[PDB]
Design a protein around this ligand. Sequence first.
Ligand code: KWT
Length: 279
Amino acid sequence: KEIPDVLVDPRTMKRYMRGRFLGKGGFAKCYEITDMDTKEVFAGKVVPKSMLLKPHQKEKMSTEIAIHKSLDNPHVVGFHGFFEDDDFVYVVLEICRRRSLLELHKRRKAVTEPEARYFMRQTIQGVQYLHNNRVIHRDLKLGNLFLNDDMDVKIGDFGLATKIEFDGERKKDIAPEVLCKKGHSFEVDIWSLGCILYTLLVGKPPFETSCLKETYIRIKKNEYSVPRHINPVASALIRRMLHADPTLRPSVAELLTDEFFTSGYAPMRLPTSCLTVPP
Ligand SMILES: *c1oc2c3c1C(=O)O[C@H](COC)[C@]3(C)C1=C(C2=O)[C@@H]2CCC(=O)[C@@]2(C)C[C@H]1OC(C)=O
């Protein structure tokens, strides 16, 4: 199935011109799309109906779209509408031309402490908004923290996001709670954030190994080592964020007010040079 040059929808009746290829993920291709009337650029997510044959797969996406539709926050990827077609499902999103924190990390390795502060603060502010709206991301990673031209963090990929419907709800359908199938809520996002902060400051993920089975065992037994080179203040925060007990992990609200975010220089802006070299 060939993707149309002009993407049209019955609802808004706006015309989107399919342009520059931006990348793919899980056989879902993404393109730089331009509104043929207003001339504003968006990231057009194109996913084929041949991938969503099973009603199980149709659902997921419907939950993903529903959750993302509700969201509006300067640190969450802007959702600007979706529409079906004969062959494809098109999702219109805020465009992030500067890839993700994963591409930055692979190029930079261990970043400077002030950079970690900047990136984490914006990400946590994003996660706080999600948690205040009873949304758990569940898949927070460097590859999901997208960057725009101004180097602002935008959280995306809600393909594993859920809504907490009631108080004290534990979910059964990566943190130790999920691997043990014991039940989880908001504190799985804090765990992931701890992994991210570790990876930014150290240069490598805390549980990474060549074997997938060995990685899961280390998570279960809480086997990681924050190197001696890391600032004790940052080291203390990581250990609390990655606590074996989900209850002893800090809430998203007390993350911002931690010593780490107040002890040293916290830049309010970052230049695009941080993609390749230290500032
Ligand atoms: C599924 O929601 C999104 C994406 C997919 C996908 O197929 O891969 C990537 C994400 O990789 C983890 C997709 C295309 C991307 C986005 C997305 O929401 C981003 C949101 C804002 C943006 O600029 C997008 C479209 C970039 C894109 O990630 C890549 C590969 O650049």
